[PDB]
Amino acid sequence: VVGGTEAQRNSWPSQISLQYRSGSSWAHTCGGTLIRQNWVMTAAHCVDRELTFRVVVGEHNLNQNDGTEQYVGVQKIVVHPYWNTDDVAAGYDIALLRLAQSVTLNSYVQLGVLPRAGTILANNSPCYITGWGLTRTNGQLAQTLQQAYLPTVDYAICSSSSYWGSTVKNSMVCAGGDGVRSGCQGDSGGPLHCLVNGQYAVHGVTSFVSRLGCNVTRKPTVFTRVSAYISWINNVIASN
C-alpha cells in the first residue's frame, strides 16, 4: 500500500496474509479475506504458481511475533473457472481457499462481511484498501498492516479513455487514482473495505495496478467486484 498509515491492530480482522514456502521460511505474497472459519477469498492470480501456501490470520507485523497469529495450511484451491492468467483485464480474478483447519475467531480474527449480490457503489464512495504490499512503486513490503483511504471511481469514469479504458470491466471496482495512495505488489488478493449503511463490507479483491507504477494519477487501483460473485462463492463453498 503506497501512501498508507499503519492500521490499528483490531481494525481489519478478516484480513489475512497468504504466504508460500521458500526453503526453511515462508514469504508473504498476497492478502486475502477470511469469509468462513475455513475459507479464504483471494485473487486467482495469487495462486497461479504451483506453490505451497499457508494463510496467517490474526497477523499484524509480518516480521515479529504479535502473540495473536494462527497459521493454517491451504487444503484446496478453487480458482474462478473463467480466469485466464495472461488476461487479468478480462476479470474473474478471484479464488477461494479451503483451509486445512477451521481457525478460532476472537477480536483479531473475524469473518469479512460481503456485499449483497449486484450492489454497485456510487462514485466516490468511502473505502480503505489494506495490506502488507510495497510501500512505494518498486519498493519493499510493509512490516505492519497498512491502510489507505481510496474513494471508488465509478465504472463510467473508470472505463473512460483518460483512466483505464476498455481494460476495466463492470465486474470490477476501481478506487483511488489520486497519484499518491494505491495498492502495490503484495496487496493483491486482499480486501477493499467500503462503508455502507454504517457497516464496512469487503466490496473488492485487490487485482491490479498500472504497469507504469502503483500510485499513478488516473490509474486507480482495480479490484474484482465481490458483489458480482456472490452466487459463485456460495456455490463453491456449498459443494466443498
Ligand SMILES: [Ca+2]
Ligand atoms: Ca507477526
